Structures are given as structure tokens and as C-alpha cells.
Amino acid sequence: KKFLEKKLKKIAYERIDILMSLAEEEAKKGNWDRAKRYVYLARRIAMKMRIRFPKKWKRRICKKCGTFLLYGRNARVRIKSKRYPHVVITCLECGAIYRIPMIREKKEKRRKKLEERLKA
Amino acid sequence: MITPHNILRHELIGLKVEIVEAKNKAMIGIKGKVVDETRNTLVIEKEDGREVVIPKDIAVFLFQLKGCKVKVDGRLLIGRPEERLKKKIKILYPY
RNA sequence: GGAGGGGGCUGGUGACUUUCCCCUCUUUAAGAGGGGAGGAAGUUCCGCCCACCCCAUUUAUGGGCAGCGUCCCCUGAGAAGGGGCGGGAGAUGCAGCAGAAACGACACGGCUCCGGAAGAGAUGACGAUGAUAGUGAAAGUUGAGGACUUCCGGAGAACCGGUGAAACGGGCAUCUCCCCUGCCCGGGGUGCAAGCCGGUUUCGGCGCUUAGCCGAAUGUCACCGAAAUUACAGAAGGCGGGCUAUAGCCCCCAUUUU
RNA sequence: GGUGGGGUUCCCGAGCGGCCAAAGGGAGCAGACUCUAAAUCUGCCGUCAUCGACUUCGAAGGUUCGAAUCCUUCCCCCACCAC
Ligand SMILES: [Zn+2]
């Protein structure tokens, strides 16, 4: 007999998904403080459950203030790859600026191009 | 999915709710969704447009799931939902 | 007006019995009078009076306490509750995974130089997963008959870390010292079931009480009042601080409400 | 009234803030073994009962990235005291 198929960490991951989806759904209405409360509760349950953030909702939030970042409204997203490949998220509310360095994927593409050169 | 057994640990925010019994007479008859949740308090926005502050331990709640309607005391919902999903065991005896 | 939280108080008089107790008193042995559990007695976290044992007789050195109200942090229906008190140095830890890197800085990749290999002179390599290209190069403006390149290894002035709660740099907690301010000087250890005496195993007396039992006394009823024996709940050497649980009224604060 | 302590699996008992880390022993079940049984060994060991994963460390609150563990409160269990 199997009554409990869903464990504590599974319901924790479901609460992560539901809370951050409701954060996105409520952040577009005009209440950024309610969305900050959702991100704060999701971050508190992430540090409490010792579970990692999903890669979908990972870069959509700010670590300093906690505002859910709408790209374009209160978040400026620019891709610069002259010196090193990076995608920069800029919070318009407080001013915290984060980025996405892509050096090792460029290294993998570079090794694939070296293999295509040496085979040819 | 949200189950009637794990509704003691599922998140209450984002679910329609009505209360059926309470000691406050004017509390009976409200219908709305859950927005904010603290240790023994729900902040419920009515369909009419009024925000109400409902204590949990004085009333019983009927949560509307995907088709389901589950009646749970707020005495079972004691604690912040953070600590409630940590682990909260509540055993109630209405003698 | 209704659940709840905090603060204040918890007895007096009259009658019965020494056969509820203790003390005092006279008197044909029995009576009369007075007093008799509280805010916590519980919890034992502590300190002092009182004792013994050691060092010492010292405010020279040194030891102990405090920085209150205020403020900060955390959780509640935001009234209320709990914790803390200044600054520096040294050491440890922030597991596992991830990340270049987990507590002092660094090795590492983008940047510059050198050596080797491969392609190439109106050709070809590369390039919207960004080209010659600039800025204090976190960041932002730029966006292509743009265009001379790419890799590996070694050495270096400045800038940068897809991760995680927390990062070329500032944090957190613990421990020990020196930098302050004010007060007080015997320092430790055990504790009244300590300690002392008749006795010399075992017992009785002191510590012991404007209540003072120890095989653990403080009884019953009515009433003024409305603070009342109703809830938590009971002394044991005494006093002061803090915690825990609530009966009745008073005061203050909050949600629903109108 | 007083001091020094302990509460973890059915019972006796360990455990650095960290992957059921939960040492374990005895017990139950199953395997193995034996003509049968004892002893030895192996897995479940609380549950699904193959790997593996989740819950319980007396109870609550709080700190923390995270509690058997660190702090506070509520408790109980020991040991010995009249001379
Ligand atoms: Zn911001």
C-alpha cells in the first residue's frame, strides 16, 4: 500500500514552483511589494529546505533587495561579448547589477572548432 | 498536485477559500482568495473588493482545490507556513 | 458589546473548640486573651546574615559588577514578549555539491610579450553564440565589400567572477588578551539534613522564628464588601532579584463590528 | 530544603551543527546452513520491506544556510542526605 507518494522535498519543490509562478503573475499587476514578499518567502523556504533554485526562476530575482525582475520594466538585460561573453541583468529599483559569464561554453565551442580544424 | 491530506503542509496562497464556522458572527459568509499568510492569520481579498484579516484559530476554513472542497481548522494551520512546511504536527481533541 | 495580552491587590470582623496548634495568665482543672500559609511558598538560576577548612592580611598588584532609560535584532491580530550592550589584535569554523576561489591572500580564465604548429597575398580563415574597434575598461552607448586571424605552454602593472545565504573582497559566531568609564574591597570551596552541646553506635537540646512543624500543626460556618477562598496552588533558618501558571475586579492596547 | 548529572529504534547504550552520518548490541522477520535444531554470517532493520529514499533523537519557541547538538522555557528520570 502506497498512500504517501509525495515526500517533503517534493512538496517543497512544488511550493517553490507555485510561489514563484504566483510571483510572476502578481508582479505584472503593479504590486512590486507583494512580489517581493513572494520572493522573500520562496528564498526563506529555499534556505530552510536546503534545496536549490530551479534554473527557470534562478536569474529572474535580485539577491540584494528581493524584487521580482520584469525584463524591460525594472530590469535591463544587455548582452556584451567583446572582451568576455556576458549577459548583464540590471535592477532599476535599487541598483544591484548581476551578470551571466559564459566563458566555459565559449571554451567548449573553441575546442570543437579546434577539432574541426585539425580533422580538416 | 494539491491533496486534501497534505493540505496541512501545502501552500494556502493562491487558492479560493470560504469559511463556514467562526466565533465572530460577521466573519461567516466571506468568499475570496488568499494573498498573505502569517502565523495564525490569512489576508483575504473578497470578490467584492474588501481586504479582511482572518485569524486562523477561531474559525474553520473550507479551501477550494481543483474541484475539491476541504474543511480544515485553522488550529491545524497554526504556525508560519515556513515552519509549517519545516514540520508541524498538530493533534486536536474537541472534547 | 465578544475570545485574548500586560500591570495592581488577595483579607477583616463575629461565634465554636485547647478535643486544630503555639504562647501568656490566674484559678476548688479548666477557662480567658492574642496570633496562625502567599505572590509565588513551586522551579534552585543566584547573592547576602551564619558556620567551618586553606592561602593571605592586599584597594601596590589584582578581582567582582554595571554601560541603564535609549537603541538594535526576531515573531505575533504589531499593543506586547525574548536576547544583547563600546573598539582592536590573534586563532578556529561557515560541512557536501557548485564555483577559479569559503574566509589572510592567492594559483586560474579574459588583457600584454615570447616560442611552436596550421591556412593565406584583387584568394582563404573568422564574424549578429558579435568584426578593425574606445571608455575610471562593474556597467552603458554602439552593430558588418566588417575583415587579418586561431590554438597551446611560460612569465607579469590595473579591472572582472555562470555558483551559493554569504566573495580579488567584505561579513557572521566562538575563545583569549591588551584600549576605556564609574563603584566596591580579604580571595576560594561547601552548605542549616551546614555547624555546636549532653551523649560518644543511636537519640534529646541550640541555630528556630511578632506562624514555626518535623510520622511535616495553620479547622468549620455566616456576613460587610465586591479584592476574596474562588484558578495556579502550600512554608521548614531568614532576606532580596529573575523565570513559570492563572481565579475576581480595576486600568490600558488590538481584530470583527456599527 | 540541597548538590553532580541523564532522557536517542521493542530493551540495554554511543554519537564532530551537515549526505536515514544516526556506533551499535540483544530482539522480530527472511536468507544461508543443518536430517532437525543450537551457534556463526547476510539483508529488512519504523515504513515502502530488491538498491535507495522518508520519519523519530522528552515537548515547545528562538538562532542559523541547515538542529539529537547552540540558547530559553516547560517537564520527567537517577544517586544520596533526619543522626
Ligand atoms: Zn532593487
Numbering used by the authors:
A (entry chain H): 2 to 121
B (entry chain F): 1 to 95
Give passages from the manuscript.
RNase P is an ancient ribonucleoprotein (RNP) complex that catalyzes the maturation of the 5′ end of precursor tRNAs (pre-tRNAs). In contrast to bacteria, archaeal and eukaryal nuclear RNase Ps have evolved considerably more complex protein subunits, four to five in archaeal and nine to ten in eukaryal enzymes. To gain insights into the structure and function of archaeal RNase P holoenzyme and its evolutionary relationships with bacterial and eukaryal enzymes, we reconstitute the RNase P holoenzyme from Methanocaldococcus jannaschii (M-type) and determine its cryo-EM structure alone and in complex with a tRNA substrate. By using homologous structure modeling based on the crystal structures of bacterial RPR from Thermotoga maritima, archaeal components from P. horikoshii, and the cryo-EM structures of both yeast and human RNase P complexes, we generated an atomic model of the dimeric MjaRNase P holoenzyme, containing ten protein subunits and two catalytic RPRs.
To further understand how the tRNA substrate is recognized and processed by MjaRNase P, we mixed MjaRNase P with E. coli pre-tRNATyr at a ratio of 1:10 and subjected the mixture to cryo-EM single particle analysis. Notably we obtained the three-dimensional reconstruction of MjaRNase P in complex with the mature form of the tRNATyr substrate at a resolution of 4.3 Å. Although pre-tRNATyr was used in the cryo-EM analysis of the MjaRNase P-tRNATyr complex, the ~4.0-Å resolution at the catalytic center suffices to show that the 5′ leader of tRNA is absent in the structure, indicating that the tRNA molecule in the complex is the mature tRNA product after cleavage. The structure of the MjaRNase P-tRNA complex shows that MjaRNase P adopts the same dimeric conformation as the apo structure with two tRNA substrates bound into each of the two active sites. Superposition analysis revealed that binding of the tRNA substrate only induces a ~8° change in the angle between the two MjaRNase P monomers, suggestive of a rigid dimeric MjaRNase P architecture. The MjaRNase P-tRNA complex structure reveals that MjaRNase P employs a double-anchor mechanism to accommodate the coaxially stacked acceptor arm and TψC arm of tRNA into the substrate-binding pocket. In the S domain of RPR, CR-II and CR-III fold into two interleaved T-loops to form one of the anchor (referred to as the T-loop anchor) to stack with the TψC and D loops of tRNA, securing the corner of the L-shaped tRNA in the substrate pocket of MjaRNase P. The two RNA anchors respectively locate in the C and S domains of RPR, functioning as a measuring device to recognize the coaxially stacked acceptor and TψC arms of tRNA substrates, which measure a fixed distance of 12 base pairs in all tRNA molecules. Rpp30, Rpp29 and Rpp21 form a continuous highly basic surface that is complementary to the L-shaped tRNA, burying ~890 Å2 interface area between the tRNA and proteins.
